Amino acid sequence: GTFTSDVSSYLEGQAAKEFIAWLVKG
Amino acid sequence: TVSLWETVQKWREYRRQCQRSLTEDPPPATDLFCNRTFDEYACWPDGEPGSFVNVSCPWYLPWASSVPQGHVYRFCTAEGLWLQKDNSSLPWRDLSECEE
Ligand SMILES: CCCCCCCCCCS[C@@H]1O[C@H](CO)[C@@H](O[C@H]2O[C@H](CO)[C@@H](O)[C@H](O)[C@H]2O)[C@H](O)[C@H]1O
């Protein structure tokens, strides 16, 4: 199943990934 | 997990190194070459007219270890302008090999 640590990790990983997307799209 | 702040740090060093290449690489054989550029994502060398230009997936990507031999692409037109996307002023690129 999915745990609270999975969601918090996902959120942090997403911060970096959005930055990459800001770099690209623009 | 790979954090935002570490990715930003890596990105800054990528940009630093790129700017150093932009300044220090020798000029192209002709002004018909497409011009080197940093587009905030990748460092592009000068391009030969009528050719594809390739560069490695930027090493600052959180998943760069998953795309170790990937490349991103531009096309340098025969007039020494980077190929543009319709409507826009923006350059065509293929980044598909560097997706997560
Ligand atoms: C619809 C037409 C528009 C598509 C344009 C987008 C693609 C243009 C660039 C061509 S990509 C193609 O990738 C191939 C690898 O998958 C590349 O394969 C070759 O070089 C590779 C290293 O990059 C190497 O691993 C292979 O052993 C070698 O065969 C190929 O050169 C490249 O053109």
CA torsion through residues B60, B21, B95, B87, sign: positive
CATH number (domain holding residue B95) = 4.10.1240.10
Q: How many domains does one find in chain B?
A: 1
- What is the C-alpha to C-alpha distance for residues B82 and B80, in angstroms, rounded to an integer? 7
Which residue ranges have their beta carbon within 6 Å of ligand 1? B 52, 69, 71, 73, 94
Q: How was this structure determined?
A: X-ray
Tell which atom from ligand 1 comes closest to the C-alpha of B97. 16
Domain residues for the domain of B38 are 1-100
Resolution of the experimentally solved model in angstroms? 2.1
Contacts of A23 in chain B (CB under 8 A): 11, 40-41
Could you please report the per-residue DSSP string of B32-77?
TSBP-EE-SS-EEPPB-TTEEEEEEPPTTSTTGGG-TT-EEEEEE-
H-helix or E-strand containing B86? Answer: none
Ligand 1 atom, smallest distance to B94 CA: 6
Residue among B1, B8, B40 minimizing CB distance to A26: B40
Contact B54, B73 (CB under 8 A): yes
Residue with tokens 């020494």: B80
